[PDB]
């Protein structure tokens, strides 16, 4: 009955020498990490960027997420500040589990998330501050843009190769900016790959962990076949870009069908890299703040 956690994806803890450049580092770990689809990177302990969003004016209208909307086939929106969203998020989680938010084990949130996704008896609705452009209120990383103050001790982070604003994003051919995610408990993203099969890199600036699931690219077609077998018939014929709006699937279902799935809890201050055509999905353990961008090698 209970969710069975997938095996853990690789975690790398590069020394300062190895931490010199994301592209060089990712190229070096690729023989392992491309076989798990996702990996986690823990920066050296002394690498701690300051949070550089304009928190005063940070306002947003999160999207509403009904966990069991797909099983349902078988109000709208409030404006928040970062602060008021956090107060709502913590209240929701502590009320839901009847304990302080930081005392809820990550395995319990995970088990309850997947129970709720398939539950026809309990309708749980959460909110996700998803796809907030970093051009709106700024990146979470400091940038030498002249649109905000950079202290001297923050300049190294504005120039760091691991600053997501400094990733190479142009694709080579003869023929843009990071996105922000303000999470609460159970807010989620369903299974998808990136446009152009790009890499993506994801940084959790602060807050409670983000739980990830990843599938290596050599199993992409197997996952797509399981999806096509088990997706609602009304959605079976949809183009992939539209189907990926609603590709919610319990990782154990994929695993029972022979699809390799790995998991990780991304904690604050840690990066998650997804490799080309590595399907991934996840959910937030609680109030947090993430930044993500696609890049090409």
Ligand X SMILES: O=C(O)c1ccnc2cc([C@@H](OCCN3CCCCC3)c3ccccc3Cl)[nH]c12
SS3 291: strand
| Closest CB 132 distance from ligand X, rounded Å | 10
Q: Number of residues interacting with ligand X: please give it, by CB under 6 A.
A: 12
Task: Determine whether the annotation assigns residue 91 to a binding site.
Answer: no
Which two tokens mark 93?
């989680």
Contact criterion met (CB below 8 Å) for 293 and 235:
no
Min separation Cβ 86 and ligand X, Å: 17
Binding of residue 292 to ligand X (CB under 6 A)? yes
**Between 114 and 179, whose beta carbon lies closer to ligand X?**
179
Binding of residue 113 to ligand X (CB under 6 A): no
Q: Is 205 annotated as a binding residue?
A: no
The whole-angstrom separation of Cα 59 and Cα 136 is 9
Q: State how far the alpha carbon of 11 is from the alpha carbons of 67, 158, 200, 203, 262, in Å.
A: 29, 25, 16, 14, 12
DSSP secondary-structure letter at 167? S
| Residue 72 Cβ vs ligand X, minimum distance, rounded to whole Å | 17
Task: Please name which of 89, 31, 34 lies closest in space to residue 206, comparing C-alpha atoms.
Answer: 89
Six-digit token pair at 38?
């996702």
Between 193 and 226, name the residue whose CB sits nearer to ligand X.
193
Out of 60, 85, 128, 289, the only residue in the binding site for ligand X (CB under 6 A) is 128
290 binds ligand X (CB under 6 A): yes
Report if residue 190 touches ligand X, rule: CB under 6 A.
yes
CB proximity list for 99: less than 8 A, separation 6 or greater: none
Q: What tokens appear for 164 in the block?
A: 């997501």
Q: Which of 58, 137, 179, 295 binds ligand X (CB under 6 A)?
A: 179
Q: How many residues does the chain have?
A: 297
Furthest CA-CA distance within the chain: 58
Question: Which residues line the annotated binding site?
Answer: 128, 192, 194, 200, 202, 210, 280
- Numbered residues of the known binding site for 2-oxoglutarate: 128, 200, 202, 210
Binding positions for ligand X, rule: CB under 6 A: 128, 130-131, 179, 181, 189-190, 192, 202, 210, 290, 292
């Amino acid at each position: 009955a209970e969710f069975v956690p997938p095996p853990e994806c690789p975690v790398f803890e590069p020394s300062w020498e190895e931490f010199t450049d994301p592209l060089s580092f990712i190229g070096r770990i690729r023989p392992l990490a491309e076989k798990t689809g996702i990996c986690k990177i823990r920066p050296p302990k002394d690498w701690q960027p300051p949070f550089a969003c304009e928190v005063k004016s940070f306002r947003f209208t999160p999207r509403v997420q009904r966990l069991n909307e797909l099983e349902a086939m078988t109000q709208a929106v409030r404006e928040y500040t970062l602060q008021s969203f956090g107060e709502m998020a913590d209240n929701f989680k502590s009320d839901y589990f009847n304990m302080p938010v930081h005392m809820v084990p990550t395995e319990l949130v995970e088990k309850e998330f997947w129970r709720l996704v398939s539950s026809i008896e309990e309708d749980v609705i959460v909110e996700y501050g998803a796809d907030i452009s970093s051009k709106d209120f700024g990146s979470g990383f400091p940038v030498k843009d002249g649109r905000r103050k950079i202290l001297p001790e923050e300049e190294e982070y504005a120039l760091s190769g691991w600053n997501l604003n400094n990733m190479p994003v142009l694709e080579q051919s003869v023929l843009k900016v990071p996105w922000l995610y303000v999470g609460m408990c159970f807010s989620s993203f369903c299974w998808h790959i990136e446009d152009h099969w790009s890499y993506s890199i994801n940084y959790l600036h602060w807050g409670e962990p983000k739980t990830w699931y990843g599938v290596p690219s050599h199993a992409a077609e197997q996952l797509e076949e399981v999806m096509r077998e088990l997706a609602p018939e009304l959605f079976e014929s949809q183009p992939d870009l539209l189907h990926q709006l609603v590709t919610i699937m319990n990782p154990n279902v994929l695993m029972e069908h022979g699809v390799p799935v790995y998991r990780t809890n991304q904690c604050a201050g840690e990066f998650v890299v997804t490799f080309p055509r590595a399907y991934h999905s996840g959910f937030n353990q609680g109030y947090n703040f993430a930044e993500a961008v696609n890049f090409c090698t």
